[PDB]
């Protein structure tokens, strides 16, 4: 199967392809959230720890934490939940969903790195990726800089440069509260 690995310290991610039943099999009967020590899966990932988070079987149905089961089942789903985005106020749909227990019926495992191993993984540890948007509400700026209700925000807000060609500009949020 294909592994979907995220390094959420850097905000990085890359996919990996494992053929070899014995290399995979380490993931079997493991549930969502279980940790998995790395070396078993490869020599690259030696030491690395993975917390499983979800992923898809063939036919593409998403896993859903909490089901248990290594099979698929059809559930009534509601507002505020995984694997369902409601079309209408108070709409519920009965939908197929995959169990949270890993089997070889999965096209893709979704892992999140919890501990770094002894060696670097290129697109993941080597590369590092900027947090798209900065604090907008007053006291969140105060916190992301540690400030006191003294320091005055305005000159602490983020300032994003972007060019008109020969006119390079500067846009900041609009503080709230």
């Amino acid at each position: 199967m294909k592994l979907n690995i995220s390094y959420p310290v850097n905000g990085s991610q890359k996919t990996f392809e494992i053929d070899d039943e014995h290399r995979i099999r380490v993931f079997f009967d493991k549930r969502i959230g279980q940790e998995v020590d790395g070396e078993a899966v490869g020599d690259e990932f030696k030491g690395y720890v993975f917390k499983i988070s979800g992923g898809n079987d063939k036919q593409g149905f998403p896993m859903k934490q909490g089901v248990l089961l290594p099979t698929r089942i059809k559930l009534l789903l509601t507002k505020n939940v995984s694997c369902y985005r409601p079309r209408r106020d108070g709409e519920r749909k009965r939908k197929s969903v995959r169990g949270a227990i890993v089997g070889p019926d999965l096209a893709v495992l979704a892992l999140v790195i919890v501990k770094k191993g002894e060696q670097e993984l290129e697109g993941l540890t080597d590369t590092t990726v900027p947090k798209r948007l900065g604090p907008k509400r007053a006291n969140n700026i105060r916190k992301f800089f540690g400030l006191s209700k003294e320091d005055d925000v305005r000159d602490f807000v983020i300032r994003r440069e972007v060019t008109k060609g020969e006119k390079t500009y500067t846009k900041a949020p609009k503080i709230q509260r």
């Binding site: 905000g11 590092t128 990726v129």
Partner: peptide, 15 residues
């Protein structure tokens, strides 16, 4: 238990 680590760039902000 066992946990954690460090820091990544943000684009328009190198480490």
């Amino acid at each position: 238990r066992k946990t954690v680590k460090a820091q990544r760039p943000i684009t328009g902000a190198s480490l």
